[PDB]
């Protein structure tokens, strides 16, 4: 049953499909090649066939030549037989150089073969700070690495008691090249050193990862220059923050009323926080590896009055200025750290397309032991700001009388608003944000829109939920009047925007294919449905701007919504 | 014991398999338990959260009533029996081969009779469970798996989170889960969906994403199990086979509420009255019109076929008993199915001609492949006899059909190279295969001999069972007949194209010259193996001969192949002269 009957099939299938294709190399002949050029130009998701795989296993010359087509063929094969491996490693060299983009797909667990992994590093050989943006998603891909850690465990822990194959020195050569990519990446890594006892307990391999992080620290420190000890020291100084958040866990425990806890905090921070903040020698900021602290002012220090204990404080830096900051401690904030990071990646591509969404990517990181910190925010969070004002128009006029409601002309406040609004709807289409309300709506009076509730995603709401668009009946006041101008400008910006992201988000499909290996809740069910849903939701299947007409009908239905 | 490859276990398990959530129903999961070390894909469930209901009492009893009967359906080995608090995991075998998945997995297997046979095996289960009343059940390819006897073993778990297509030869496609609902592509029921609610549960109102928008649960009414609801579901799984793709469109569903749709009947055998009518009978309005599995059976396209089914169904029940003892089946089944043949497609002397005109008794028996796949399982040399009998029993598998069949044989020369004179069995069969006259469907067919045979010839160097070699030089001409059969594709390839000045007729022959240069390689590689054997008057080591003076035996048989390599009479003559010189000394 799972006996020779199972294998018999495999042979008959191996014969003719193997042995036939791969022979003495020459160029493809027929005009079916022109049709096939279209067929191969099918996107990443477009998984290959039992017969199409065979065709490429024939048509090698054009595949060699089309420098970036190689990957589609690499999707077809596996390194099942040494004879396969032989032709595969032959052709690895033969093929006109692969795309550094398409180099991401081949690092997947699909292709366990070291030579591929070694050569993919050459395909994406550019040791540059672009990797820092890649650090916004790569951790789930890095989760497919817990095999070679046991191999390199033979080496890295042992020895201390550019052209290369060693991914760890690809890492060292690229990352140690910049202090940001060393230290901030280590703090990012500290979020995975957190809870490593479960990855030791269920897997065992987190103990190997603890050895790995130890041996990376050894590999850096053995570099033996001022730079190498200094980065080891700045981590140590930043680790004092862990002591401070344990003290802040104790201060949180001595609660009273909002004012009584605030007084206890202001007093305890007055002695302890002023002394420690002044005491530390130029350890860097959470928002910036370059900014460094030289004080904290316990006077203006305040708190969000909620169980997460979000902080609101200001730090007299080495640079003189009193930088605003926020911590959240006693929360595994990984849902938000990943979301803001991916947002940053999307924002980079979107800025490569010259549209800025005016959203605030606030920095977030972890120093040690599940404690963490982030960039602070100034806000006007609710419909109550607009209700304190006379209307959406009166709200503009009050704050910025250049706008002066309808009677003035607001310039960039309005421009930033319209281009921002045209951005925020696109973000809501893709991310499927949940639990939106009139109280999750930080209208910065300057033109910067902040809709904010990203923690609920993939439509997480009880049954009725927020739309893929970004509009409500309050905005329907101002926008219904400024329909001719602002709704059209909204409509034109978003129309042009989607059409540009339809160009090049194919690489995000590769990123998605690796970054999907992360922690985000209920992922036990969602994957295959999600990959299909993404391609369908943005209907890459149908590049018809009539879909925007369908969406514009939904927009009509949105103003209609009291009866639609 | 209590964990295994997940912290989530409470016994020895192989792996966690797939999970899913319905639109018509709640969540579900699959699990591959290595019970007694035997890894099998059981149902997942937790009794912890389901204690509030535990209504399962009834369900377990209907399970007992149903599982009692081991027919062409799937009885579970201990399903009902395998409830517990942390682990209510209803016991089942290593299933994940859902049905359309299996179909696209072997289009090589997909065949005229075969689809009909599969379909008919399912039909017997349907009419049986209607009689052993378990009315109103749902259907999708999640409900089935394909056994070694090619039986469509029908279960009662129509969501299989392990389910999609398979080995589809044309493809450049992204993932397709949740294709027309919150899970796998379902089969709608007109009364359930278009009438009350597509959902299974009770209520008194009307949601959408899980479906109730049609009516307010008839103000708190229950499920109403009927044959008409079964005919509805069967109708949607069927078209998926015919088109190779499902019919599930929301436009089509609105049109099904309207009782009138958007057909595009993609196959002539499906729009063939035989198939079209009873499908249409399902399609008009299941309760308003009539469709009867009975009417379908009585009106089998050929009424010969129902009888061919139910007659041989008796054997299929013996097959269901055979789960006791395979080797006993092999050999007594030889005895029995002498009679089986004499009943069915009888030849008076038990060696059917493989090409008996336009078949004079009308054979296209995909069931030999059924049995073949059963008898693949290792047991005893009982098997040797029946295979030789089968070689003699040269039933009408086409060239291609025999070729499809040709997967396991040499595979079993290899699988029992350990018994060196399995080589002798295989000799006869391949000699027979060569003696059979048939047409090569594709050019490449002949090359696989030209590489297969090399491999097996190395196995001949492992141990030289002489009998195989003796036949070799004879059926060398039959392998050249395999080249003639390749040359018949050269006739077909010609059927695809439509002196002193230096004419162009060379272009017609030239590729055949290069083909002949290739075949000359295929004379030379024998000339290599042959010259090695010719110096090897014994298999030679440390000044001793494993006495291939047996070359003198095969020497008579050799005249057949000797015509082929001979023209380098220089080379042949030298090697033979070296042999003559020594024979003249040592040999008498």
Contact yes or no for A2 and B94 at CB 8 A? yes
CA–CA dist A470, A460 (Å, integer): 17
> CA separation (Å) from A306 to A261, A303, A311?
11, 8, 10
Closest partner residue to B173 among A2, A40, A47, by Cβ? Answer: A47
Q: Which residue of B has its CA nearest to A540?
A: B174
Contact yes or no for A20 and B452 at CB 8 A? no
**A288 shares contact with chain B (CB less than 8 Å):** no
Helix (H) or strand (E) holding A314: strand A311-316
B370 is in an annotated binding site: no
From A269's Cα to the closest Cα of chain B, the distance in A is 44
From A527's Cα to the closest Cα of chain B, the distance in A is 9
Write phi, then psi, for B17 (nearest 5 degrees): -95, -175
**A46 shares contact with chain B (CB less than 8 Å):** yes
**B173 shares contact with chain A (CB less than 8 Å):** yes
Interface test with A, best of B172, B445, B449 (most A CBs within 10 A): B172
**A542 shares contact with chain B (CB less than 8 Å):** no
* Long-range contact pairs involving B314-321 (C-beta distance under 8 Å, separation at least 24): B315/B340, B316/B72, B316/B121, B316/B149, B316/B151, B317/B71, B319/B149, B319/B151, B319/B374, B320/B70, B320/B71, B320/B72
Q: Which residue of B has its CA nearest to A201?
A: B7
Experimental determination technique:
cryo-EM
- Cα-to-chain-centroid distance, residue B397: 15
**Under a CB-based contact definition with an 8 Å cutoff, are residues A358 and A416 in contact?**
yes
From A372's Cα to the closest Cα of chain B, the distance in A is 29
Specify the DSSP class assigned to residue B378.
-
* End-to-end Cα separation, chain A, in angstroms: 58
Question: Per the structure block, which two tokens stand in for B181?
Answer: 């609902």
Residue located via tokens 């379909």: B119
**Under a CB-based contact definition with an 8 Å cutoff, are residues B185 and B179 in contact?**
yes
* Long-range contact pairs involving B307-312 (C-beta distance under 8 Å, separation at least 24): B308/B344, B309/B120, B309/B121, B309/B124, B310/B124, B311/B343, B311/B344, B312/B344, B312/B367
- Cα-to-chain-centroid distance, residue B156: 23
CA–CA dist A122, A120 (Å, integer): 5
Helix (H) or strand (E) holding B302: none
- Cα-to-chain-centroid distance, residue B511: 37
Closest partner residue to A39 among B94, B172, B408, by Cβ? Answer: B172
> CB neighbours of A476 closer than 8 A, spacing ≥ 6?
A558, A559
CA–CA dist B553, B565 (Å, integer): 20
Write phi, then psi, for B544 (nearest 5 degrees): -140, 150
B115 is in an annotated binding site: no
- Cα-to-chain-centroid distance, residue B188: 29
Please choose, from the candidates A285, A276, A308, the residue with its C-alpha nearest in 3D space to the C-alpha of residue A187: A285
Tell the burial category of A340 from Cβ atoms under 10 Å away from its Cβ (0-12, 13-18, 19+).
buried
**B479 shares contact with chain A (CB less than 8 Å):** no
Contact yes or no for B448 and A525 at CB 8 A? no
CA–CA dist B547, B111 (Å, integer): 50
Which residues is A293 bridged to in the sheet?
Answer: A317
Query: What is the full DSSP assignment across A417-433?
Result: HHHHHHHHHHHHHHH--
Question: Per the structure block, which two tokens stand in for A502?
Answer: 């339809």
> CB neighbours of B190 closer than 8 A, spacing ≥ 6?
B232, B256, B257, B259, B285, B286, B287
CA–CA dist B438, B394 (Å, integer): 13
**B378 shares contact with chain A (CB less than 8 Å):** yes
Tell the burial category of A159 from Cβ atoms under 10 Å away from its Cβ (0-12, 13-18, 19+).
exposed
- Cα-to-chain-centroid distance, residue A159: 35
**B106 shares contact with chain A (CB less than 8 Å):** yes
CA–CA dist B502, B18 (Å, integer): 69
B21 is in an annotated binding site: yes
Tell the burial category of A396 from Cβ atoms under 10 Å away from its Cβ (0-12, 13-18, 19+).
buried
Contact yes or no for A531 and B175 at CB 8 A? yes
Write phi, then psi, for A303 (nearest 5 degrees): -145, 145
The sheet with strand B38-43 has its strands ordered as B15-21, B27-35, B38-43
Q: Which residue of B has its CA nearest to A19?
A: B448
B29 is in an annotated binding site: yes
> CB neighbours of A217 closer than 8 A, spacing ≥ 6?
A232
B26 is in an annotated binding site: yes
Closest partner residue to A16 among B167, B411, B448, by Cβ? Answer: B448
Interface test with A, best of B22, B40, B151, B175 (most A CBs within 10 A): B175
**Under a CB-based contact definition with an 8 Å cutoff, are residues A328 and A310 in contact?**
yes
Question: Per the structure block, which two tokens stand in for A487?
Answer: 């709704």
- Per-residue three-class SS string for B165-192: CCCCCCCEECCCCCCCCCCCCCCCCHHH
B57 is in an annotated binding site: no
Task: State chain B's maximal CA–CA distance in angstroms.
Answer: 107
Helix (H) or strand (E) holding A268: helix A258-268
Burial per residue of A10-35, b for 16 or more beta-carbon CB atoms within 10 angstroms, e otherwise: ebbbebbbbbbbbeeeeeeeeeeeee
Contact yes or no for A463 and B448 at CB 8 A? no
- Concerning whether B525 is annotated as a catalytic residue, the answer is no
**B148 shares contact with chain A (CB less than 8 Å):** yes
Handedness of CA A14, A15, A16, A19 (dihedral sign): positive
Question: Per the structure block, which two tokens stand in for B59?
Answer: 């369900």
Burial per residue of B383-409, b for 16 or more beta-carbon CB atoms within 10 angstroms, e otherwise: bbebbeebbebbbbbebbbbbbbbbbb
From B535's Cα to the closest Cα of chain A, the distance in A is 31
Question: Per the structure block, which two tokens stand in for A228?
Answer: 């190498």
Closest partner residue to A11 among B94, B178, B411, by Cβ? Answer: B411
Question: Per the structure block, which two tokens stand in for A24?
Answer: 């003495």
CA–CA dist A510, A141 (Å, integer): 10
Contact yes or no for A12 and B170 at CB 8 A? no
CA–CA dist B333, B327 (Å, integer): 9
3-state secondary structure of B67: helix
From A525's Cα to the closest Cα of chain B, the distance in A is 6
Q: Which residue of B has its CA nearest to A45?
A: B174
3-state secondary structure of A104: helix
Listed by number, the residues of chain A in 220-239 with a beta carbon closer than 8 Å to a beta carbon of chain B are none
Handedness of CA B270, B252, B183, A536 (dihedral sign): positive
Question: Per the structure block, which two tokens stand in for A517?
Answer: 């290996």
**A39 shares contact with chain B (CB less than 8 Å):** yes
Contact yes or no for B178 and A532 at CB 8 A? yes
> CB neighbours of A20 closer than 8 A, spacing ≥ 6?
A54, B444, B447
CA–CA dist B75, B81 (Å, integer): 13
> CA separation (Å) from B445 to A53, A250, B459?
19, 79, 22
Residue located via tokens 């390199």: A152
CA–CA dist A520, A332 (Å, integer): 11
3-state secondary structure of B574: helix
Write phi, then psi, for A63 (nearest 5 degrees): -60, -45
CA–CA dist B300, B312 (Å, integer): 16
Closest partner residue to A45 among B106, B170, B175, by Cβ? Answer: B175
Interface test with B, best of A12, A37, A53, A540 (most B CBs within 10 A): A12
Closest partner residue to A531 among B94, B174, B404, by Cβ? Answer: B174
Burial per residue of A313-339, b for 16 or more beta-carbon CB atoms within 10 angstroms, e otherwise: bbbbbbeeeebebbbbbeeebbbbbbb
From A140's Cα to the closest Cα of chain B, the distance in A is 20
Tell the burial category of B137 from Cβ atoms under 10 Å away from its Cβ (0-12, 13-18, 19+).
middle
Listed by number, the residues of chain A in 449-468 with a beta carbon closer than 8 Å to a beta carbon of chain B are 463
B518 is in an annotated binding site: no
Interface test with B, best of A38, A41, A49 (most B CBs within 10 A): A49
- Write out chain A residues lying below 8 Å of B170, CB-based: 49, 51-52
CA–CA dist B459, A291 (Å, integer): 74
**Under a CB-based contact definition with an 8 Å cutoff, are residues A531 and A510 in contact?**
no
Residue located via tokens 């003076």: B549
Specify the DSSP class assigned to residue A143.
G
B25 is in an annotated binding site: yes
Catalytic member of B18, B137, B206, B405: B137
**A14 shares contact with chain B (CB less than 8 Å):** no
Provide the angle, in degrees to the nearest 10, between the axes of the packed helices A506-515 and A527-537: 160
CA–CA dist B473, B469 (Å, integer): 7
Burial per residue of B511-525, b for 16 or more beta-carbon CB atoms within 10 angstroms, e otherwise: eeeebeeebeebbee
CA–CA dist B295, B174 (Å, integer): 41
Contact yes or no for A20 and B444 at CB 8 A? yes
Q: Where are the beta strands (DSSP E) in A347-461?
A: 364-366, 372-375, 441-443, 449-451
Tell me the helices (H) and strands (E) count for chain A, helix number first: 26, 8
Q: Which residue of B has its CA nearest to A202?
A: B7
Specify the DSSP class assigned to residue B25.
S
Q: Give break positions in chain B: residue before each, C–N beyond 2.5 Å.
A: 498
**B232 shares contact with chain A (CB less than 8 Å):** no
3-state secondary structure of A154: coil
B383 is in an annotated binding site: no
Question: Per the structure block, which two tokens stand in for B470?
Answer: 């003796």
Burial per residue of B295-332, b for 16 or more beta-carbon CB atoms within 10 angstroms, e otherwise: ebbeebeeeeebebbeeebebbeebbebeeebeebbbe
Interface test with B, best of A3, A5, A43, A460 (most B CBs within 10 A): A5
Contact yes or no for A46 and B173 at CB 8 A? yes
Torsion of CA A198, A202, A204, A207, to 10 degrees: 0
- Write out chain B residues lying below 8 Å of A15, CB-based: 448, 452
Cα angle vertex A282, ends A276, A288, to 5°? 110
């Amino acid at each position: 049953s799972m006996e020779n009957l199972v294998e018999s099939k495999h042979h008959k299938l191996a014969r003719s499909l193997r042995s036939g294709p791969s022979d003495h190399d020459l160029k493809p002949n027929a005009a079916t090649r022109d049709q096939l050029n279209i067929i191969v130009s099918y996107p990443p998701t477009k998984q290959l066939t039992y017969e199409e795989q065979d065709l490429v296993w024939k048509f090698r010359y054009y595949l060699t030549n089309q420098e970036k087509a190689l990957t589609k063929f690499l999707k077809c094969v596996n390194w099942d037989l040494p004879q396969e491996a032989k032709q595969a490693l032959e052709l690895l060299g033969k093929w006109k150089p692969m795309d550094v983009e398409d180099s991401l797909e081949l690092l997947s667990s699909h292709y366990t073969n070291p030579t591929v992994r070694r050569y993919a590093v050459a395909r994406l050989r550019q040791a540059d700070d672009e990797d820092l943006l890649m650090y916004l998603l790569q951790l789930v891909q890095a989760l497919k690495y817990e095999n070679f850690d046991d191999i390199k465990n033979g080496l890295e822990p042992t020895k201390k008691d550019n052209l290369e194959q060693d991914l760890c020195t690809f890492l060292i050569s690229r990352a140690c090249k910049n202090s940001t990519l060393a230290n901030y990446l280590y703090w990012y890594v500290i979020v995975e050193c957190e809870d490593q006892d479960t990855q030791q307990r269920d897997p065992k391999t987190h103990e190997m990862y603890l050895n790995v992080m130890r041996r990376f620290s050894q590999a850096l420190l053995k570099g033996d220059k001022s730079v190498r000890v200094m980065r080891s020291l700045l981590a140590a100084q930043q680790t004092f923050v862990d002591r401070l958040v344990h003290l802040m866990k104790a201060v949180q425990r001595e609660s009273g009323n909002r004012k009584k806890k605030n007084e206890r905090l202001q007093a305890l921070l007055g002695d302890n926080e002023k002394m420690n903040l002044s005491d530390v020698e130029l350890i860097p900021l959470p928002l910036e590896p370059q900014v460094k602290i030289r004080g904290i002012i316990p006077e203006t220090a305040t708190l969000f009055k909620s169980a997460l204990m979000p902080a609101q404080l200001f730090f007299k830096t080495e640079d003189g200025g009193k930088y605003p900051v926020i911590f959240k401690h006693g929360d595994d904030l990984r849902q938000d750290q990943l979301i803001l990071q991916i947002i940053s990646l999307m924002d980079k591509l979107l800025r490569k397309e010259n549209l800025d969404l005016k959203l605030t990517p606030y920095k977030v990181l972890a120093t040690s032991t599940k404690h963490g910190f982030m960039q602070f925010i100034q806000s006007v969070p609710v419909a109550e700001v607009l209700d304190t004002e006379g209307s959406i128009q009166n709200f503009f006029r009050k704050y910025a009388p250049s706008e002066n409601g309808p009677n003035g002309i607001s310039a960039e406040v309005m421009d930033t608003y319209v281009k921002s609004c045209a951005g925020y709807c696109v973000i809501t289409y893709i991310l499927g944000v949940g639990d939106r309300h009139l109280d999750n709506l930080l209208l910065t009076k300057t033109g910067k829109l902040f809709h904010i509730d990203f923690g609920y995603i993939l439509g997480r709401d009880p049954k009725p939920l927020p739309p893929p668009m970004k509009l409500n009946k309050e905005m329907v006041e101002g926008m219904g009047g400024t329909q001719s101008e602002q709704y059209q400008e909204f409509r034109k910006q978003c129309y042009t925007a989607f059409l540009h992201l339809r160009r090049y988000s194919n690489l995000i499909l590769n990123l998605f294919s690796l970054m999907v290996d992360a922690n985000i809740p209920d992922i036990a069910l969602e994957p295959d449905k999600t990959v299909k849903k993404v391609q369908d939701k943005f209907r890459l299947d149908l590049s018809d701007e009539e879909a925007v007409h369908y969406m514009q009908s939904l927009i009509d239905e949105s103003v209609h919504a009291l009866f639609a | 014991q209590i964990l295994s490859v997940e912290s989530y276990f409470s016994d020895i398990h192989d792996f966690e398999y797939d999970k899913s959530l319905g639109s018509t129903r709640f969540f579900k999961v699959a699990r591959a338990k290595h019970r007694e070390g035997l890894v099998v894909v059981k149902v997942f469930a937790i009794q912890d959260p389901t204690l509030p209901l535990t209504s399962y009492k009834q369900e377990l009893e209907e399970l007992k009533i149903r599982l009692n009967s081991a027919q062409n359906c799937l009885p579970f080995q201990k399903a009902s029996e395998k409830a517990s608090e942390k682990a209510a995991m209803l016991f089942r075998q290593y299933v994940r081969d859902n049905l359309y998945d299996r179909i696209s997995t072997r289009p090589f297997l997909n065949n005229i009779e075969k689809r009909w046979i599969a379909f008919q095996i399912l039909t017997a289960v349907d009419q049986a469970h209607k009689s052993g009343v378990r009315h109103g059940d749902i259907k999708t390819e999640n409900v089935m798996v394909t056994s070694w006897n090619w039986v469509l073993l029908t279960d009662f778990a129509s969501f299989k989170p392990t389910y999609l297509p398979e080995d589809n030869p044309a493809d450049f496609n992204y993932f397709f889960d949740t294709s027309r609902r919150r899970t796998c592509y379902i089969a709608p029921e007109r009364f359930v969906d278009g009438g009350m609610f597509a959902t299974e549960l009770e209520y008194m109102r009307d949601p959408s994403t899980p479906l109730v928008d049609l009516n307010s649960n008839q103000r708190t009414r229950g499920e109403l199990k009927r044959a008409m609801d079964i005919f509805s579901a069967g109708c949607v799984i069927a078209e998926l086979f015919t088109e190779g793709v499902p019919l599930f469109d929301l436009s089509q569903l609105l049109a099904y509420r309207n009782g009138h749709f958007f057909p595009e009947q993609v196959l002539n055998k499906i729009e063939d009255h035989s198939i079209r009518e009873l499908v249409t009978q399902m399609i008009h309005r299941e309760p308003d019109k009539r469709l009867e599995a009975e009417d379908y059976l009585k009106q089998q396209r050929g009424n010969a076929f129902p009888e061919i089914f139910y007659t041989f169904l008796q054997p299929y029940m013996a097959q269901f008993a055979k789960e006791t003892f395979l080797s006993a089946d092999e050999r007594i089944l030889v005895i029995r199915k002498d009679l089986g043949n004499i009943i069915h497609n009888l030849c008076g002397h038990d060696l059917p001609e493989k090409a008996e005109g336009e078949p004079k008794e009308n054979g296209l028996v995909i069931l030999v492949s059924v049995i073949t796949s059963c008898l693949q399982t290792l047991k005893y040399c009982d098997s040797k006899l029946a295979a030789l009998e089968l070689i003699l029993h040269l039933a009408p598998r086409l060239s291609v059909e025999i070729l499809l069949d040709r997967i396991t044989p040499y595979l079993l020369h290899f699988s029992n190279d350990s018994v060196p004179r399995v080589r002798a069995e295989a000799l006869r069969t391949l000699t027979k295969v060569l003696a059979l006259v048939k047409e090569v469907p594709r050019n490449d067919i002949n090359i696989y001999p030209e590489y297969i045979l090399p491999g097996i010839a190395h196995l001949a160097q492992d141990d030289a069972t002489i009998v195989r070699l003796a036949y070799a030089e004879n059926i060398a001409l039959l392998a050249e007949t395999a080249l003639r059969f390749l040359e018949l594709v050269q006739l077909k390839n010609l059927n695809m194209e439509n002196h002193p000045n230096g004419n162009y007729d060379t272009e017609l022959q030239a590729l055949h010259e290069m083909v002949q240069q290739k075949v000359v390689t295929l004379l030379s590689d024998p000339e290599n193996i042959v010259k090695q054997t010719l110096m090897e008057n014994g298999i030679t080591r440390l000044c001793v001969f494993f006495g291939r003076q047996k070359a003198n035996d095969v020497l008579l048989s050799h005249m057949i192949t000797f015509l082929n390599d001979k023209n380098d009479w220089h080379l042949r003559g030298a090697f033979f002269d070296s042999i003559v010189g020594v024979a003249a000394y040592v040999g008498w």
